[PDB]
Design a protein around this motif. Structure first.
Motif, PDB file in Angstrom:
ATOM      1  N   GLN A 168       0.604  -1.544  -0.226  1.00  0.00           N
ATOM      2  CA  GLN A 168      -0.249   0.343  -0.397  1.00  0.00           C
ATOM      3  C   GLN A 168       1.058   1.248   0.314  1.00  0.00           C
ATOM      4  OE1 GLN A 168      -1.793   1.048   3.467  1.00  0.00           O
ATOM      5  NE2 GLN A 168      -1.673  -0.979   4.813  1.00  0.00           N
ATOM      6  N   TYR A 169       1.721   1.726   0.606  1.00  0.00           N
ATOM      7  CA  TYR A 169       2.622   2.506   0.845  1.00  0.00           C
ATOM      8  C   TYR A 169       3.795   2.173  -0.241  1.00  0.00           C
ATOM      9  CZ  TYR A 169       0.969   1.497   5.696  1.00  0.00           C
ATOM     10  OH  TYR A 169       0.394   0.763   6.513  1.00  0.00           O
ATOM     11  N   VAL A 170       4.049   1.674  -0.742  1.00  0.00           N
ATOM     12  CA  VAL A 170       4.786   1.382  -1.901  1.00  0.00           C
ATOM     13  C   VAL A 170       4.564   1.197  -3.424  1.00  0.00           C
ATOM     14  CG1 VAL A 170       6.594  -0.816  -2.259  1.00  0.00           C
ATOM     15  CG2 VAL A 170       6.860  -0.402  -0.079  1.00  0.00           C
ATOM     16  N   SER A 171       3.738   0.756  -3.640  1.00  0.00           N
ATOM     17  CA  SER A 171       3.289   1.186  -4.709  1.00  0.00           C
ATOM     18  C   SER A 171       1.757   0.741  -4.505  1.00  0.00           C
ATOM     19  CB  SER A 171       4.176  -0.093  -5.293  1.00  0.00           C
ATOM     20  OG  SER A 171       3.100  -0.282  -7.613  1.00  0.00           O
ATOM     21  N   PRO A 172       0.721   1.648  -4.879  1.00  0.00           N
ATOM     22  CA  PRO A 172      -0.864   1.540  -4.292  1.00  0.00           C
ATOM     23  C   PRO A 172      -1.455   0.410  -5.727  1.00  0.00           C
ATOM     24  CG  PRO A 172       0.330   3.465  -3.904  1.00  0.00           C
ATOM     25  CD  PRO A 172       0.924   3.204  -4.563  1.00  0.00           C
ATOM     26  N   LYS A 173      -0.801   1.030  -7.044  1.00  0.00           N
ATOM     27  CA  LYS A 173      -1.374   0.434  -8.484  1.00  0.00           C
ATOM     28  C   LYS A 173      -1.463  -0.762  -8.285  1.00  0.00           C
ATOM     29  CE  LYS A 173       1.183   3.992 -10.747  1.00  0.00           C
ATOM     30  NZ  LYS A 173       1.520   4.497 -11.664  1.00  0.00           N
ATOM     31  N   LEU A 174      -0.248  -1.163  -7.694  1.00  0.00           N
ATOM     32  CA  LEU A 174      -0.334  -2.913  -7.934  1.00  0.00           C
ATOM     33  C   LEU A 174      -1.498  -4.026  -6.848  1.00  0.00           C
ATOM     34  CD1 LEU A 174       3.545  -3.198  -7.821  1.00  0.00           C
ATOM     35  CD2 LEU A 174       1.771  -3.943  -9.725  1.00  0.00           C
ATOM     36  N   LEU A 210       1.605 -13.716  -6.499  1.00  0.00           N
ATOM     37  CA  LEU A 210       0.794 -13.617  -6.996  1.00  0.00           C
ATOM     38  C   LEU A 210      -0.601 -14.812  -6.875  1.00  0.00           C
ATOM     39  CD1 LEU A 210       2.216 -12.608 -10.493  1.00  0.00           C
ATOM     40  CD2 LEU A 210       1.400 -11.275  -7.958  1.00  0.00           C
ATOM     41  N   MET A 211      -1.470 -14.440  -7.247  1.00  0.00           N
ATOM     42  CA  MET A 211      -2.521 -15.433  -6.997  1.00  0.00           C
ATOM     43  C   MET A 211      -3.548 -15.857  -8.808  1.00  0.00           C
ATOM     44  SD  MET A 211      -4.020 -17.503  -4.792  1.00  0.00           S
ATOM     45  CE  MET A 211      -5.905 -19.025  -5.633  1.00  0.00           C
ATOM     46  N   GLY A 212      -3.421 -17.390  -8.877  1.00  0.00           N
ATOM     47  CA  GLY A 212      -3.888 -17.440  -9.889  1.00  0.00           C
ATOM     48  C   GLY A 212      -5.610 -17.651 -10.306  1.00  0.00           C
ATOM     49  N   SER A 213      -6.241 -16.747 -11.032  1.00  0.00           N
ATOM     50  CA  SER A 213      -7.361 -17.491 -11.082  1.00  0.00           C
ATOM     51  C   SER A 213      -8.617 -18.391 -11.148  1.00  0.00           C
ATOM     52  CB  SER A 213      -7.840 -16.589 -13.204  1.00  0.00           C
ATOM     53  OG  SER A 213      -7.088 -16.981 -13.649  1.00  0.00           O
ATOM     54  N   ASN A 214      -7.263 -19.508 -11.357  1.00  0.00           N
ATOM     55  CA  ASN A 214      -7.451 -21.069 -11.042  1.00  0.00           C
ATOM     56  C   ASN A 214      -8.182 -21.153 -10.128  1.00  0.00           C
ATOM     57  OD1 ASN A 214      -5.293 -20.866 -10.016  1.00  0.00           O
ATOM     58  ND2 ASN A 214      -4.310 -22.848 -10.969  1.00  0.00           N
ATOM     59  N   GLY A 215      -7.552 -20.814  -9.220  1.00  0.00           N
ATOM     60  CA  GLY A 215      -7.171 -20.920  -7.990  1.00  0.00           C
ATOM     61  C   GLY A 215      -6.569 -20.919  -6.953  1.00  0.00           C
ATOM     62  N   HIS A 216      -4.945 -20.942  -7.879  1.00  0.00           N
ATOM     63  CA  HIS A 216      -3.553 -21.686  -7.068  1.00  0.00           C
ATOM     64  C   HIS A 216      -3.266 -20.171  -6.734  1.00  0.00           C
ATOM     65  CE1 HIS A 216      -1.774 -25.206  -5.533  1.00  0.00           C
ATOM     66  NE2 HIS A 216      -0.771 -24.549  -6.699  1.00  0.00           N
ATOM     67  N   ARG A 265      -6.359  -6.149  -9.742  1.00  0.00           N
ATOM     68  CA  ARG A 265      -7.381  -7.555  -9.537  1.00  0.00           C
ATOM     69  C   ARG A 265      -8.207  -7.794 -10.714  1.00  0.00           C
ATOM     70  NH1 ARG A 265      -9.087  -4.968  -6.138  1.00  0.00           N
ATOM     71  NH2 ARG A 265      -7.336  -5.406  -4.211  1.00  0.00           N
ATOM     72  N   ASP A 266      -8.289  -9.779 -10.636  1.00  0.00           N
ATOM     73  CA  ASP A 266      -9.085 -10.213 -12.608  1.00  0.00           C
ATOM     74  C   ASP A 266      -8.169  -8.968 -13.240  1.00  0.00           C
ATOM     75  OD1 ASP A 266     -10.088 -10.457  -9.963  1.00  0.00           O
ATOM     76  OD2 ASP A 266     -11.935  -9.227 -10.136  1.00  0.00           O
ATOM     77  N   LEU A 267      -7.219  -9.042 -13.342  1.00  0.00           N
ATOM     78  CA  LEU A 267      -6.553  -8.391 -14.767  1.00  0.00           C
ATOM     79  C   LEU A 267      -6.274 -10.149 -15.813  1.00  0.00           C
ATOM     80  CD1 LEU A 267      -3.735  -6.406 -13.575  1.00  0.00           C
ATOM     81  CD2 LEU A 267      -6.062  -6.092 -13.349  1.00  0.00           C
ATOM     82  N   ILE A 316      -4.987 -19.819 -19.518  1.00  0.00           N
ATOM     83  CA  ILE A 316      -4.348 -19.015 -19.509  1.00  0.00           C
ATOM     84  C   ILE A 316      -4.302 -18.939 -18.311  1.00  0.00           C
ATOM     85  CG2 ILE A 316      -3.957 -16.453 -19.436  1.00  0.00           C
ATOM     86  CD1 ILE A 316      -4.701 -16.271 -22.156  1.00  0.00           C
ATOM     87  N   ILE A 317      -3.395 -18.679 -17.211  1.00  0.00           N
ATOM     88  CA  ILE A 317      -3.617 -18.355 -15.220  1.00  0.00           C
ATOM     89  C   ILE A 317      -3.457 -17.136 -15.635  1.00  0.00           C
ATOM     90  CG2 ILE A 317      -2.379 -18.955 -13.029  1.00  0.00           C
ATOM     91  CD1 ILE A 317      -4.008 -21.702 -14.389  1.00  0.00           C
ATOM     92  N   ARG A 318      -4.293 -16.651 -14.975  1.00  0.00           N
ATOM     93  CA  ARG A 318      -4.496 -14.834 -15.012  1.00  0.00           C
ATOM     94  C   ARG A 318      -4.326 -14.446 -13.526  1.00  0.00           C
ATOM     95  NH1 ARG A 318      -6.669 -13.722 -19.102  1.00  0.00           N
ATOM     96  NH2 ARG A 318      -8.062 -15.117 -20.853  1.00  0.00           N
ATOM     97  N   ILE A 319      -3.932 -13.673 -13.603  1.00  0.00           N
ATOM     98  CA  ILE A 319      -3.564 -13.064 -12.183  1.00  0.00           C
ATOM     99  C   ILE A 319      -4.753 -12.088 -11.704  1.00  0.00           C
ATOM    100  CG2 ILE A 319      -1.952 -10.937 -11.386  1.00  0.00           C
ATOM    101  CD1 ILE A 319      -0.108 -11.053 -13.548  1.00  0.00           C
ATOM    102  N   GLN A 320      -5.310 -12.084 -10.145  1.00  0.00           N
ATOM    103  CA  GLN A 320      -5.968 -11.498  -9.875  1.00  0.00           C
ATOM    104  C   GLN A 320      -5.345 -12.151  -8.370  1.00  0.00           C
ATOM    105  OE1 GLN A 320      -8.905 -13.361  -7.975  1.00  0.00           O
ATOM    106  NE2 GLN A 320      -7.612 -14.783  -7.716  1.00  0.00           N
ATOM    107  N   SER A 321      -4.432 -11.027  -8.305  1.00  0.00           N
ATOM    108  CA  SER A 321      -4.351 -10.240  -6.464  1.00  0.00           C
ATOM    109  C   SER A 321      -2.274 -10.239  -6.837  1.00  0.00           C
ATOM    110  CB  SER A 321      -3.526 -11.981  -5.812  1.00  0.00           C
ATOM    111  OG  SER A 321      -5.326 -12.234  -5.008  1.00  0.00           O
ATOM    112  N   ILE A 322      -2.076  -9.280  -6.047  1.00  0.00           N
ATOM    113  CA  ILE A 322      -0.782  -8.828  -5.655  1.00  0.00           C
ATOM    114  C   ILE A 322      -0.952  -8.768  -4.321  1.00  0.00           C
ATOM    115  CG2 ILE A 322       1.251  -7.243  -6.169  1.00  0.00           C
ATOM    116  CD1 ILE A 322       0.076  -6.621  -8.087  1.00  0.00           C
ATOM    117  N   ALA A 323      -0.209  -9.530  -3.086  1.00  0.00           N
ATOM    118  CA  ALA A 323      -0.116  -9.791  -1.820  1.00  0.00           C
ATOM    119  C   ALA A 323       0.650  -8.227  -1.352  1.00  0.00           C
ATOM    120  CB  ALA A 323       0.775 -11.018  -1.228  1.00  0.00           C
ATOM    121  N   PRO A 324      -0.131  -7.829  -0.338  1.00  0.00           N
ATOM    122  CA  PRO A 324       0.008  -6.182   0.368  1.00  0.00           C
ATOM    123  C   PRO A 324       1.461  -6.915   1.103  1.00  0.00           C
ATOM    124  CG  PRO A 324      -1.409  -7.706   2.006  1.00  0.00           C
ATOM    125  CD  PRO A 324      -1.729  -8.133   0.471  1.00  0.00           C
TER     126      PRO A 324
END
Ligand SMILES: Nc1ncnc2c1ncn2[C@@H]1O[C@H](COP(=O)(O)OP(=O)(O)NP(=O)(O)O)[C@@H](O)[C@H]1O
Lengths: 325, 96, 317, 621
Positions: free
Chosen positions: D256-262, D306-312, D266-268, D282-290
């Motif tokens: 949050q303090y380092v890179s708010p954009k990341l 990162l969190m894969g859209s597949n659930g991994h 979500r749901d990229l 395709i394993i889509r990116i929906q997360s960037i752990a804070p």
């Protein structure tokens, strides 16, 4: 929180008292009662709680055999510890039933990891005994582990021989070749026995060594059996069937049957179905290879019902074999 | 039909489950039939079986865990392994 | 230090040199040599100064005066230096180190820079002097013995064994034969053509001598050229006869017990004025003076805290 | 002469190109080797009109998917001066973007940020070419590139390193232009302005002093008197002390303090880096752990999640100041070797597959690394085991010092003596017992040890071919679940470690006493030596493909980071050819597989070579 329940050493020794367990059913029953008594007498309250489900569910009993024994063993006195050690020695030595021996081997292996240290068996922490029993019960990985412990304690050509045997039975030809290389590097003075090449599967060298030993000494049952094993492996059906003919004419009935086990394959190789019938008749009835040989015979005489019966018997024996490995 | 070996490729568990029967049930007829099935499907190459298919944690932690903390861990691990299996309700009572 | 006719020097990893009397085995004095360990200890022909080789530098001390400081110190070399040699008059000095360059030095001047340099492919190690004092025989890590003429630069080289590091160099006082060893433990010998001013110094090969199996790292001839003693990393030393090069001698410090074995390499040797007595180092913190004919303990020089490396031993009446 | 030879080359090459294209179309997946063959012909003789026409026909006929395997090579030639070759590569990359833009965006995203004008222009052209169908993907990828550059190295580390190096340039080198050129972009870092809470905090904390020091620097420019620069460097040293004290405290980083954009992302639709395969969803990116863990190493690499859209879930390492393009290329070489070992049945049986991890370089000096789970670095393993046994960690080195407190000054044979004593006096059995204890049971343990020995042999021997260096216990990892050895650094390659003045290594690979003891009791001669025999058999049998990959390596300036560089590359490739063919040791002779393997094992095990290595290399271990 809760305290440690006090172990009743009397019942612990009583449970380990397998003096009158003989048959497979007797030994399996003894294992069941042992595990249940261990859970009942365990000092850790959680295990004794699990006891009831273990009684209602045998696999539950099996799963916590190790932990229950560890609790009890840590709860015993040194003298009582030695008494229990002797009792488990007797239990290991009494009979090599697969299930009980495997459970005991798993106990020993488990306690190897524990910080308390392995079980102080008679002289060698059980390395010799556990290795022998594991080899007997086809738990070959444990056999290799304990044989390597023997090697660390000091290498001998017998240890190398057993190491090669285990590695071969463990389907690791390259490790076996490594053992041979080490033996040559450090024991080159010792001529390599034909049995070693027999296990390593350089059948050519084994056959050459056996030919040499035959030139030195004939009519030796072990030497003949090994040479003809090499012949079978090399597929030399001609020489195999020849030597089978002479020795079969000249060799004792028990060795005759052992040799016939594969003289049958020789007869297949040359198609001499009469010799095939003779050798198969020599092979015992209640034998997997003998059963299959009698099946193929019966199908050569077109006795389909007998062949089907032989197939059923051989499949029972193979069911035992699969349940083993 | 001759639908040999291909069953392993399509259905990997097919192999393992067969062996499980040789461990699970005790009927000689069923086991003999299982052996005949395994034979008919062919002795699959072990590497091919591995390609088709693609406690330990308790022992590893035990290597670190003390005995007093160790016993409840295994107790609950085995209890819950039995517990999850929904076919063991009459056992689930003693489990709880 | 020179009161006794016989003077013995010793050094180790403790950064302290020590001196001794041969027959009595009595310590005369200790000396401080810090900033590096001691590779080679040598005594000039005049026996007025001792040279000790270390890392990047060579430090000299005085004999006539007791308890002096380093009288001279040569620096400049960018790598460790283990080789020492002097001309019979005490004028020239010859050294060589792992930096692949052997250097000449003037002792009777302030020529702090090397008179000359001779480079070779591989790192250089112990060097020895042709008795005519016009040729240096050098051993390196590539296995190539280099014969370099000081005056005319007539240079020759020979590799007796394929790509094996050789660590030794010495030629008999008669200049009749030369010998060396290497890491494999084999000992090699060559015959010398009888040319003093011929300047060609042609060599003749002689049969290989598998003296040892472990690292053979030393080689010395007696003042009379009768004997050739080589130390070896099997904590052993073997002495061979110059006339026949047949071995009847053994100097072993093996404990006998297998567990106590690997105690410490035999690290140096030096012949007496008649070849009778031999003074040799040992990395078990020790040096020992034995009788060559009997090959038995006669004296040991204890006192070191860390392992011994090299010795300097001169005999005079 | 030259023209006649060119005609001969063309008339032997056009059939080569056509045949390779047909073979590639026929193989359908096991065609990496042939793909490199055709790339070699393309980048060498492509410019000839007939060769280019054949290439165009092949490109039309060949399935596009194959080209994925060699995207890194293609973009490595993106700025090829030869106009025809560059045009054809541009068309090919445009098609690849149209079909599978996920496989292509990341290296192209790097190429956009390339300082080279030609690469910059070509990358931007190709990017706008795919934008018409993948605008969202391109924008997200570029934003990820910029933001992960921001996260990878923060202004704190940037300024620590800048001041350290500039001070070395002054007090060590005195090259005025050096420090001033170094600092100027770092000043532009604020004159562009902060964009995150951490950047603003750094501004309010130190940028005032930095601005004052830059004013003093301008004073020195206009005047040149040492006083102004002295004040500038006094301020620099003050902020240097402050930030150096701060840095050990920054044991983690909050997004949050380092890179708010990341954090906001979500749901990229962007695929997780280094995990796209056309034959899989395709394993889509929906997360960037804070949270991001920072490892205490000098480079301070971040640990991202990162969190894969597949659930991994996926873990990554993020490093700055490392040109991970070399790491990516090495990883592709290891993939090639995996294909080779899977193709040969003899190796196919024994599972000689090299463990590899996805590498996604996202800048010329910073990048990502696939974080491999359940891997313990050898140094950590030995440290843990010895702490459990309470054995002093550096017991061997302590003994070495005990006999020889000045070891580093010893000659070769003195070092050999002390090292041999240190080995002998110590059991050196740590790793075997460790593999025993970590394992649940002997049945699992034996499979672990078999895989460990075979993997160590494979990767050691491939590293010898690659000339991998500095194989110290921090660069080896054991996979707990499988036991395979894993090598996690390739900064040094092609015997470069064997030539540096600071402790030049003299062993082709790591085969120290402890690893050998970790094998079966008859360690070297069993699994390891036979596996090395098989591996060299495989690699010399197909030496041409590996040579092509290493040519792709050397002919770029990476390893040297022009005629001198070409000479160096030629020499390195010649050495690699000697390694593959057997002329490495005795150039006049040719050594069969067993002979070369035995020589290598002797060289790597010999105490004479081991002792020469850096003590921190842990040769005794
Ligand atoms: N590919 C990887 N997979 C899994 N873990 C890894 C990987 N790379 C690094 N690590 C872990 O992260 C640590 C980072 O240290 P290292 O790989 O040495 O980073 P560095 O920036 O090269 N530092 P150093 O080499 O000590 O100057 C390793 O020691 C491993 O514990």
């Amino acid at each position: 929180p809760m305290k440690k329940l006090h172990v009743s050493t009397i019942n612990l020794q009583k449970a380990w008292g397998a003096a009158r367990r003989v048959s497979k059913d007797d030994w399996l029953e003894w294992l069941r009662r042992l595990s249940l008594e261990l859970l009942k007498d365990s000092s850790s309250p959680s295990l004794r709680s699990c006891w009831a489900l273990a009684q209602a569910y045998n696999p539950m009993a099996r799963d916590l055999f190790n932990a229950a024994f560890v609790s009890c063993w840590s709860e015993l006195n040194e003298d009582q510890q030695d008494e229990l050690i002797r009792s488990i020695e007797l239990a290991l030595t009494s009979q090599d039933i697969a299930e009980v021996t495997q459970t005991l081997l798993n106990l020993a292996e488990f306690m190897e990891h524990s910080d308390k240290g392995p079980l102080p068996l008679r002289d060698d922490n059980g390395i010799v005994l556990l290795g022998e029993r594991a080899a007997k019960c086809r738990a070959y990985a444990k056999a290799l582990h304990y044989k390597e412990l023997e090697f660390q304690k000091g290498p001998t050509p017998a240890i190398l021989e057993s190491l090669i045997s285990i590695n071969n039975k463990l389907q690791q030809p390259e490790a076996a070749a490594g053992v041979l290389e080490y033996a040559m590097k450090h024991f080159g003075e010792l001529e390599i026995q034909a049995t070693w090449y027999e296990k390593l599967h350089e059948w050519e060298d084994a056959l050459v060594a056996y030919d040499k030993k035959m030139d030195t000494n004939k009519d030796d049952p072990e030497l003949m059996l090994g040479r003809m094993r090499c012949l079978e492996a090399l597929g030399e059906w001609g020489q195999l069937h020849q030597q089978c003919c002479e020795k079969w004419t000249l060799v004792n009935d028990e060795t005759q049957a052992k040799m016939a086990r594969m003289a049958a394959a020789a007869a297949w190789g040359l198609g001499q179905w009469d010799s095939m019938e003779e050798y198969t008749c020599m092979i015992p009835r209640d034998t997997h290879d003998g059963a299959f040989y009698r099946a193929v015979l019966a199908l050569h005489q077109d006795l389909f019902s007998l062949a089907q019966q032989c197939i059923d018997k051989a499949r029972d024996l193979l069911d035992a074999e699969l349940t083993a490995m | 039909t001759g639908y040999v070996v291909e069953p392993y490729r399509k259905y990997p568990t097919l192999l393992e489950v067969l062996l499980n029967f040789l461990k699970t049930e005790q009927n000689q007829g069923t086991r003999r039939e299982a052996i005949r099935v395994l034979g008919l499907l062919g002795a699959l190459d072990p590497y091919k079986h591995k390609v088709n298919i693609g406690t330990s944690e308790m022992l590893v932690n035990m290597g670190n865990l003390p005995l007093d903390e160790f016993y409840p861990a295994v107790s609950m691990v085995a209890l819950m392994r039995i517990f999850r299996d929904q076919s063991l309700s009459h056992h689930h009572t003693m489990v709880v | 230090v020179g009161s006794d006719p016989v003077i013995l020097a010793t050094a180790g990893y403790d950064h302290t040199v020590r001196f001794w009397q041969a027959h009595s085995g009595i310590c005369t004095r200790t000396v401080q040599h810090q900033d590096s360990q001691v590779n080679a200890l040598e005594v000039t022909p005049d026996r007025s100064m001792i040279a000790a080789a270390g890392y990047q530098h060579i430090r000299m001390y005085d004999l006539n005066s007791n308890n002096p400081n380093p009288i001279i110190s040569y620096d400049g070399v960018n790598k460790n230096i283990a080789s020492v040699g002097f001309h019979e008059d005490g004028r020239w000095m010859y050294t060589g180190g792992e930096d692949c360059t052997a250097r000449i030095w003037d002792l009777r001047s302030r020529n702090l820079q090397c008179q000359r340099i001779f480079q070779v492919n591989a790192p250089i190690n112990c060097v020895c002097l042709h008795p005519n004092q016009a040729e240096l025989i050098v051993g390196d890590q590539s296995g190539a013995i280099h014969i370099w003429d000081l005056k005319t630069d007539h240079n020759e080289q020979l590799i007796p064994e394929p790509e094996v590091s050789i660590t030794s160099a010495h030629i008999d006082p008669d200049a009749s034969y030369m010998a060396a060893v290497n890491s494999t433990g084999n000992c090699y010998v060559w015959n010398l053509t009888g040319g003093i001013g011929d300047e060609v110094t042609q060599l003749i090969p002689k049969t290989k001598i598998p003296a040892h199996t472990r690292y053979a790292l030393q080689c010395r001839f007696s003042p009379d050229s009768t004997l050739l003693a080589t130390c070896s990393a099997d904590q052993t030393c073997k002495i061979w006869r110059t006339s026949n090069f047949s071995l009847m001698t053994e100097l072993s410090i093996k404990s006998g017990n297998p567990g106590e074995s690997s105690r410490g390499w035999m690290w140096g040797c030096a012949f007496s004025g008649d070849s009778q007595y031999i003074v040799t180092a040992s990395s078990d913190n020790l040096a020992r003076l034995w009788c060559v004919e009997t090959g038995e303990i006669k004296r040991e020089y204890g006192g070191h805290q860390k392992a011994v490396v090299c010795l300097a031993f001169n005999d005079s009446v | 002469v030259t023209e006649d030879l060119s005609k001969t080359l063309l008339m032997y090459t056009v059939p080569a190109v056509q045949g390779f294209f047909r073979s590639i179309s026929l193989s359908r997946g096991n065609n990496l080797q042939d793909t490199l063959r055709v790339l070699t012909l393309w980048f060498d003789y492509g410019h000839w009109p007939d060769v280019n026409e054949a290439l165009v026909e092949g490109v039309k006929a060949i399935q596009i998917d194959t080209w994925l395997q060699v995207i890194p090579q293609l973009i490595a030639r993106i700025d090829t001066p030869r106009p025809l070759v560059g045009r054809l590569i541009h068309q090919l990359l445009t098609d690849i973007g149209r079909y599978h833009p996920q496989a292509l965006i990341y290296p192209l995203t790097v190429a956009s940020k390339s300082t080279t004008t030609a690469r910059h222009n070509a990358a931007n052209k190709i990017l706008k070419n795919m934008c018409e169908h993948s605008n969202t993907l391109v924008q997200q990828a570029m934003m990820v590139s910029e933001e992960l550059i921001r996260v990878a190295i923060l202004w704190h580390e940037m300024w620590h390193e800048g001041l350290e190096e500039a001070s070395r340039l002054y007090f060590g080198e005195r090259n005025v232009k050096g420090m001033f050129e170094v600092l100027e972009p770092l000043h532009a870092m604020m004159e562009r302005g902060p964009q995150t809470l951490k950047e603003t905090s750094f501004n309010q904390a130190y940028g005032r002093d930095l601005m004052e020091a830059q004013e003093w620097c301008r004073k020195y420019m206009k005047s040149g008197n040492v006083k102004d620069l002295t004040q500038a460097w006094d301020l620099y040293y003050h902020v240097f002390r402050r930030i150096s004290k701060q840095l050990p405290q920054l044991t983690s980083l909050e997004l949050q303090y380092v890179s708010p954009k990341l954090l906001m992302c979500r749901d990229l639709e962007l695929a997780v880096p280094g995990t796209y395969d056309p034959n899989q969803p395709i394993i889509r990116i929906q997360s960037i752990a804070p949270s991001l863990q920072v490892i205490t190493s000098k480079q301070r690499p971040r640990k991202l999640t990162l969190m894969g859209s597949n659930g991994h879930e996926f873990v990554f390492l993020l490093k700055g100041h490392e040109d991970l393009r070399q790491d990516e290329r090495v990883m592709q070489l290891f993939g090639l070797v995996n294909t080779l070992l899977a193709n040969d049945p003899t190796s196919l049986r024994k599972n000689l597959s090299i463990q590899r991890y996805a590498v996604i370089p996202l800048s010329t000096n910073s990048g990502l690394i696939g974080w491999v789970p359940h891997c313990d670095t050898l140094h950590a393993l030995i440290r843990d085991y010895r702490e459990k046994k309470k054995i002093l960690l550096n017991i061997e080195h302590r003994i070495m010092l005990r006999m020889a407190p000045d070891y580093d000054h010893l000659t070769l044979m003195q070092k050999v003596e002390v090292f041999e004593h240190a080995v002998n006096n110590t059991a050196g059995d740590d790793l075997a017992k460790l593999l025993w204890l970590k394992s649940p049971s002997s049945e699992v343990w034996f499979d672990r040890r078999t895989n460990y020995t075979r993997s160590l042999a494979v990767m050691s021997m491939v590293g010898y071919i690659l000339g991998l260096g500095d194989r110290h216990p921090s660069n080896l990892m054991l996979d707990r679940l499988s036991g395979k050895i894993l090598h996690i650094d390739f900064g040094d390659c092609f015997e470069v470690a064997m030539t540096r003045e600071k402790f030049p290594e003299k062993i082709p690979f790591r085969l120290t006493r402890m690893l050998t003891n970790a094998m079966e009791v008859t360690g070297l001669d069993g699994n390891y030596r036979i596996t090395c025999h098989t591996v060299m058999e495989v690699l010399r049998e197909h030496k041409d493909s590996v040579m092509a990959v290493l040519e792709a390596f050397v002919y770029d300036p990476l390893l040297n980071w022009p005629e001198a560089l070409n000479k160096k590359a030629i020499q390195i490739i010649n050495r690699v050819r000697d390694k593959l063919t057997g002329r490495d040791f005795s150039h006049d002779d040719t050594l069969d597989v067993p002979t070369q393997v035995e020589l290598l094992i002797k060289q790597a095990t010999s105490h004479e070579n081991l002792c020469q290595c850096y003590i921190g290399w842990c040769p005794f271990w």
